């Protein structure tokens, strides 16, 4: 197709012109095996092995026998595994630095409470400012010219995090379906008391994702909590357990609304129980965040794990410098 | 005691001075049999047979053999039953007039929705104005410089009444414990999602009333719903059924908060199912409303029935401005 115009562009200069052409041929057919493999080869020239591996991996799901994809993937597979493991060790060192501290840290922890609430509500459509959120939580008084629903999302958030810290963080034992229901009960409660802490009764659509049918949600969730308490899940790197737990919940989509808020909170319960700080996916990241989740639906869960690992690194930085 | 000073004050003028003295002797001993009976006699001179009869009935619970209380109660008892029955027939006629109507009525019906919400929340401490309540329900936008909890009480009310009208009013069959839980779920939901539609786990105090222990709430409520569906309850005058349902639920006090709001709503479900309009206990009535509830706890549920019957008459009067 337009891939031939891309390859000719790569040969003798025109890198930017070639990259745009590759994107066009993939925009028409994102299942175009030869376009994926050629773009993967092109990505390695920019030192982007991670993307190249995804491109080669994506092609081998379409055509599991493509020779050019195969010979390249067989080289990128263990290499990327090593690149990702090294990043998780960088994260582990920054956690050692953060968990080796106090008054300097306390000031950061209070600043980030309103920051976590602002971004978890703003990522789902909420118009309230950090200043408006601070007014609501400190005063208990309403913000003028702003809907009551948007303000009850904030009261719900505060209550859910207060419940996790008080009841769930320091708690010894297995995580149950009821613990998940108690989080949502608070997240959605002040907004929708009828649906809060209750599963979806209807079939819904999340972007291009069609979650399990309401008849299957109970079996899917019982299987989910089993995985949370399974030995293999506890053997995973905490940053991997947290992203997988988040993804898996957001996929099941057990509730009408508040599935992301609950999932981003369950993720933070996981991290914290492993001695990691709570993390925030900023409202500006919605596009990549949605893209990586979409990529995980398509078969590759890795770009989401990396997105979560990057949010954890950026949270660990910020903490380090405000205490350095 | 000071009753002798009260009795002498009655002899030759000084009515106001004698009445205050009677109140003082009752403020010291509210179980003083001779003070109750003599105030009962005194009340009849003012044409208040209803209160005189309350006084004689109160004395006969303390001393079930007091001759002066007995001879008077035997006379006032069937007389009061006649006075109360006549009032219920006045109410019945005003319901016939109201349910024989339209544009004149429609204007009243809409104004009473916001009016019922304003008084049910204002009676429990809520500072929101009728105009602020109208803003919240019509716009879905918050009222500035007013707490979020006060505004979520209003959202809860609207949802609860919407659920009763849509699901409960025109529904055929028996009322369940779950229907009561569904009303409270909406009344309290937006304020306290944790406790909404869930029974008290702790023992509480309501004024001077100590409701059943949380261990007993389920048995007390199962007995309550049985009475709601019982033949004897359906045989009562609708204004009496509604007054008693409310008293019985508010006595049990099954929830941490929202007991009065659910009770005043359950009472309106009863009235409406009997073709009566919904009624409102105005915020200015909290004092009498509580006095009459305290009095029902003390053994006499009649002054609360009359309180409810008067609220129903005043509601029927506003609607009769249309004819
Ligand atoms: N393709 C997808 N598949 C699964 N989950 C997705 C997809 N795209 C977005 N999501 C998730 O769906 C959630 C949005 O649904 P929602 O229940 O309304 O969450 P919230 O209301 O708490 O903001 C977000 O957590 C997002 O992570
Ligand atoms: N002495 C009493 N005995 C029983 N119930 C009472 C007494 N005094 C008041 N009540 C009832 O208790 C209610 C207050 O309880 P509450 O849970 O706070 O209801 P709400 O918050 O909806 O107003 C009042 O509405 C009244 O109906
Ligand atoms: Mg949403
Ligand atoms: Mg109260």
Residue numbers in the entry:
A (entry chain B): 108 to 208, 212 to 434
B (entry chain A): 108 to 208, 212 to 433
Relevant lines from the article:
AMPylation (or adenylylation) is the transfer of AMP from ATP to a Tyr or Thr/Ser residue in target proteins. Interestingly, in eukaryotic genomes only one FIC-domain containing protein has been identified to date, HYPE or FICD, and it is strongly conserved from C. elegans to humans. Here we describe the first crystal structure of a eukaryotic HYPE encompassing the two TPR-motifs, an α-helical linker, and the FIC domain of the human protein. We demonstrate that HYPE forms stable dimers with structurally and functionally integrated FIC-domains and with TPR-motifs exposed for protein-protein interactions.
